[PDB]
Write a protein that binds this ligand. Sequence first.
Ligand SMILES: Nc1ncnc2c1ncn2[C@@H]1O[C@H](COP(=O)(O)OP(=O)(O)OP(=O)(O)O)[C@@H](O)[C@H]1O
Ligand SMILES: [Mg+2]
Lengths: 268, 263
Amino acid sequence: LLFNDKSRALQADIVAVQSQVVYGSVGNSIAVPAIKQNGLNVFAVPTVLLSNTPHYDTFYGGAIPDEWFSGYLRALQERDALRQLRAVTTGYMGTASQIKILAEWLTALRKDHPDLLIMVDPVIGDYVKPDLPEAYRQYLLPLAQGITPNIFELEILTGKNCRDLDSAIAAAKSLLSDTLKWVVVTSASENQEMQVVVVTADSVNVISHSRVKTDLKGTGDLFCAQLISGLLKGKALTDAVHRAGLRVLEVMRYTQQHESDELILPPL
Amino acid sequence: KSRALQADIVAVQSQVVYGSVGNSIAVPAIKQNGLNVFAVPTVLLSNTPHYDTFYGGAIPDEWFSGYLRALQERDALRQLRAVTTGYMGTASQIKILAEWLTALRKDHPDLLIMVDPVIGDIDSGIYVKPDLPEAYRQYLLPLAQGITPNIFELEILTGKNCRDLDSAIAAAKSLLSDTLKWVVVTSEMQVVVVTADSVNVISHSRVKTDLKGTGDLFCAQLISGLLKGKALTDAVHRAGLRVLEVMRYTQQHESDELILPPL
Ligand SMILES: Nc1ncnc2c1ncn2[C@@H]1O[C@H](COP(=O)(O)OP(=O)(O)OP(=O)(O)O)[C@@H](O)[C@H]1O
Ligand SMILES: [Mg+2]
């Protein structure tokens, strides 16, 4: 819309719906800083607000109440701070009810934002989380333009049973559609190899980085953070996927150099 | 030695999905000063209630209690040098925050606890949870090393008419103690710094704008200066000028929410 007046509200290119930790580097707590480094602005709508990841001996907090979550999304439209919105990334969701609301918000939002790149990360592994899969299939999946599932995630989501490249690539294809343009499947195979397969309607690219064995969390969230930034900045999908992975590696090293059990972002 | 993240400051206040108030503005400000901080939200609103709409609420007592205990169980307070408190949500939250602080004193005796008695304005009266004022005076004040209340917030804390500069100074003086080393009264723009042995009246430009969060910016900047080695009055004057600065940039930017310009 060219005929729209100037909005005195803040603007952001991305709305990241993920978890938030007071202490830690996961979800938006690590995503937002990363996006900010790429020179982009972002609004972070938490799914859950925890003291830290449930991976430590103790953690506190819970899932954001629907009325709240619902309001947070709505408010953004009312404050009129979505003119520059070019993408919406979804990470760890706390409940299926949240996914439905987000899907409702996204459906209505697309009507005005056609270039809206709804990237979705199918976090369904704690075997599977209850009710979360169907919610994804019915609400988010149909809207997602890109999905970054891992072997497992892709397996339960597609019901298919990937056992080899072709299989994993085939399942990916089955998810493509008029809306879903790509599927970035990843797998962590000491020294942990990170195998990534980029699948689209007219091509299948592959990338493979060697990774440091660690208990560091948020690497996936960080990856998605740099994936989306690389894309909103013009990089080719497979180019953005490659870099993103290199960036995550640069971060994990830097993090281990300072011997930190939680990710630390070094200048980008 | 610890491998856990560390922070010089722990900011306990409001958080908004959209807007520049509470830790939303304070954290980024603290970062600009090259300091680490852990933000513990007391309320998680969509935006400030000064808008047509707003959603969200107070963080549950168990959550709030946990966020604090977590910082300890995680052992990320090895470098803790100050704790700032801003917009609180409930008196139960302040009471919990107080106990937590009384605990930290045992292993952080030099701790600089700075509280912003967000209770009301002279042109609004008490605009927060009615129970907060009592909770402040009862639990938080006793721990505070320094506080930053406005004329009205000072009347509610001391129960004295602070409309007169001298009467206000007097009210502030009576508050000082072995714990409370200073009181930055607020009300161009006049900012009075009161210490057991002195009184400084700082005054800078004033802008007619309904920009919210400036208070939180002030404290975030004030605390940074104190921790960065600046003397009290100098820190108070710098924090105030920074805020004046920020608002000019925001207005210049034709925006209704604060925007941090490079420091
Ligand atoms: N419109 C303004 N013009 C100039 N300085 C301002 C303005 N608004 C805020 N400030 C600066 O911010 C400081 C404190 O913030 P603010 O005035 O919002 O809080 P307050 O209601 O006086 O009290 P508190 O410290 O509880 O927020 C002021 O005293 C001043 O130094
Ligand atoms: Mg105030």
